[PDB]
Structure 1
Amino acid sequence: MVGLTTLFWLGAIGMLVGTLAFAWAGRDAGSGERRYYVTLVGISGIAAVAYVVMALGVGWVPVAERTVFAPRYIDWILTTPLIVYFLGLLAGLDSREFGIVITLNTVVMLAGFAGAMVPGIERYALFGMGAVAFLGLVYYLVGPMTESASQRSSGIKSLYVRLRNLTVILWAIYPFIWLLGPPGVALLTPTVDVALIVYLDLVTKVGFGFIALDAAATLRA
């Protein structure tokens, strides 16, 4: 009475509802305002695609005693750079340090995927790398990008601190799911792990975009 099928299906339909909402909110386009909405729809659409392909049965990989949901790692590697792109859009980021942002993000994500695919205690060193790299990204989110967003309008600064807060808080939970779950000390049953990551993805993407929509509407009604 849980169904690992049904958690993936619920995540998929939630991401699709978010996709539809973010796309319909992009009807009245703008100068650059359109690209925020296309970023939101791309994020939630790739998320929905990954969740639908996982809901069938693909990607359930046997890596020594455990199951590796590789399609959700594909999802992460493809959709987290879109989120940091949105945050750079808000804060008014450069281009090279923007590349530093996205490269560090991809370092974390690649380390996580590889570590999920390694069967020995070797993988933890891999995980360690991501941790290190993560602590870089966080700083860039709270230091350089925040200082960049400081030289901006009131509403955009408020929206940036809201989104960067949610990101910095909830992204730091994924490593504990990786460690306390199948990829490490399998203390969380696959159902609990899957449900936790589904909820995390659902909020950190769709609720992220909902907050962004609301902020934009309020600031320039």
Structure 2
Amino acid sequence: MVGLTTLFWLGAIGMLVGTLAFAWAGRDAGSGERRYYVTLVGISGIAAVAYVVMALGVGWVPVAERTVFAPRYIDWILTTPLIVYFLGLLAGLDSREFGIVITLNTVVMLAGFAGAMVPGIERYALFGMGAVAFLGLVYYLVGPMTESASQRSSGIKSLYVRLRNLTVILWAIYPFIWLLGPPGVALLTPTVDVALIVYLDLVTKVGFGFIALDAAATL
């Protein structure tokens, strides 16, 4: 229990550091720019709360012979569409296309959560639904959204592509962790699972936010 608790506290601290840095960076509150900072504060702030809750030993749900971390999935349901929103803003995406990518994202996270909570082998059908919706989300990120980003200045398009790449490459690792970890075949221990996810969560949220902060200043 000590290892898992320690990892969750590390996640909480890293998320808190991001949250404070984004809130501070955003204080200037430029009318067009404010939205981006508030969104980053929401992304890392919600994650911080989730990690604190888990560190305190809340929401460790036993499912068959594994443990499900409910706050992790609730976190993702809330924070991943905020990341997609940030990317859609950057890309200058149209309202229909925003709706589509937010829908596909929500399918991924709901299917992953539901799958984690189903004891039997039918849970892999839920994983599959999420994997299919994720391929759709990736298509949008690398296709239509990238085309949309090209209507922006070269610097904004470069930022879009940088954050798009970070997002696509790291998000693609999560389903493999689900499959190899406790929700799937339970090869990886809960500690190894949590350690990998803490890194990935930190980089996809904080380590995404700092890249945007850097580009925003350099712009």
TM-score range, shorter chain: over 0.9
How many residues are matched?
A: 219
What is the distance in 2 between the residues matched to 1:61 and 1:129? 23
1:110-149 correspondence runs (5 A): 110-149=110-149
Task: Provide Cα deviations, 1:149-169, integer angstroms capped at 9, x if missing partner.
Answer: 011101100000000000000
What is the distance in 1 between the residues matched to 2:35 and 2:117? 35
Q: Is the 8 A contact 1:60 1:68 kept in 2?
A: yes
Task: Provide Cα deviations, 1:156-186, integer angstroms capped at 9, x if missing partner.
Answer: 0000000000000000000000000100111
Task: Provide Cα deviations, 1:118-173, integer angstroms capped at 9, x if missing partner.
Answer: 11110001100011110000000011100000111011000000000000000000
State the secondary structure of the residue aligned to 1:25: helix
Moved over 3 A (4+): none
What is the distance in 1 between the residues matched to 2:90 and 2:146? 10
What is the distance in 1 between the residues matched to 2:96 and 2:57? 40
Worse-superposed segment, 2-11 or 196-205: 2-11
What is the distance in 1 between the residues matched to 2:91 and 2:31? 17
> Which residue of 2 is the match for residue 89 of structure 1?
89
> Which residue of 2 is the match for residue 54 of structure 1?
54
> Which residue of 2 is the match for residue 43 of structure 1?
43
- Post-superposition shift, 1:2? 5.9
What is the distance in 1 between the residues matched to 2:172 and 2:131? 9
Task: Provide Cα deviations, 1:11-42, integer angstroms capped at 9, x if missing partner.
Answer: 00110000000010012111210110001011
- Post-superposition shift, 1:108? 0.5
Q: Is the 8 A contact 1:2 1:191 kept in 2?
A: no
**Cα RMSD (Å) of the superposition?**
0.9
The unaligned stretches of length 5 or more in structure 2 are none
State the secondary structure of the residue aligned to 2:62: strand
- Post-superposition shift, 1:96? 1.4
What is the distance in 2 between the residues matched to 1:208 and 1:26? 15
The unaligned stretches of length 5 or more in structure 1 are none
TM-score (norm 2): 0.98
What is the distance in 2 between the residues matched to 1:64 and 1:106? 25
Task: Provide Cα deviations, 1:181-206, integer angstroms capped at 9, x if missing partner.
Answer: 10011111111000000100001000
What is the distance in 1 between the residues matched to 2:82 and 2:153? 23
What is the distance in 1 between the residues matched to 2:34 and 2:108? 29
What is the distance in 2 between the residues matched to 1:213 and 1:23? 11
> Which residue of 2 is the match for residue 164 of structure 1?
164
